[PDB]
Amino acid sequence: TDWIPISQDQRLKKKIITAGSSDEQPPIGSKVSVHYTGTLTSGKKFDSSLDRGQPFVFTLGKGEVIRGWDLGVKSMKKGEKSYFEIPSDYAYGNNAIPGLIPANSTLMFEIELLSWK
């Protein structure tokens, strides 16, 4: 599978690992449920929703997650599992997460869109 650009500058992109069960996409304002695993561009894992044994839930389009996630999940179909490359300016930018993510880090995310309400 190939990288598919999500943004106009083609820097936010995804790889479809598993195609969705239908062509439904979540509307703005949906409470979306996902599985995810985050890694650095070295492959090292820094977090995964599986580590807490339940899906991760956030409201789409509200801006409570990093820009790459709002734009990325909005492009996904129900049931789709994709692999995202999120540049720093689509994530935490020049900020660092203590002990986990250095400043100006590209983030790799494996996201599976389970459902939404």
Ligand SMILES: C=CC[C@@H]1/C=C(\C)C[C@H](C)C[C@H](OC)[C@H]2O[C@@](O)(C(=O)C(=O)N3CCCC[C@H]3C(=O)O[C@H](/C(C)=C/[C@@H]3CC[C@@H](O)[C@H](OC)C3)[C@H](C)[C@@H](O)CC1=O)[C@H](C)C[C@@H]2OC
């Ligand atoms: C009350 C506070 C704690 C509250 C924590 C939770 C509900 C639990 C939830 C599973 C987060 C994880 O906690 C185990 C943990 O997930 C990471 O490890 C991670 O994988 C990540 O990157 N995620 C989480 C999954 C969605 C994308 C992204 C995100 O957008 O996360 C959001 C994020 C950090 C946004 C910042 C907010 C500040 C802005 O300035 C910045 O803008 C540049 C963007 C998270 C969801 C926030 O909305 C909510 C919180 O912070 C972060 C690396 C650090 C984060 O712990 C803090």
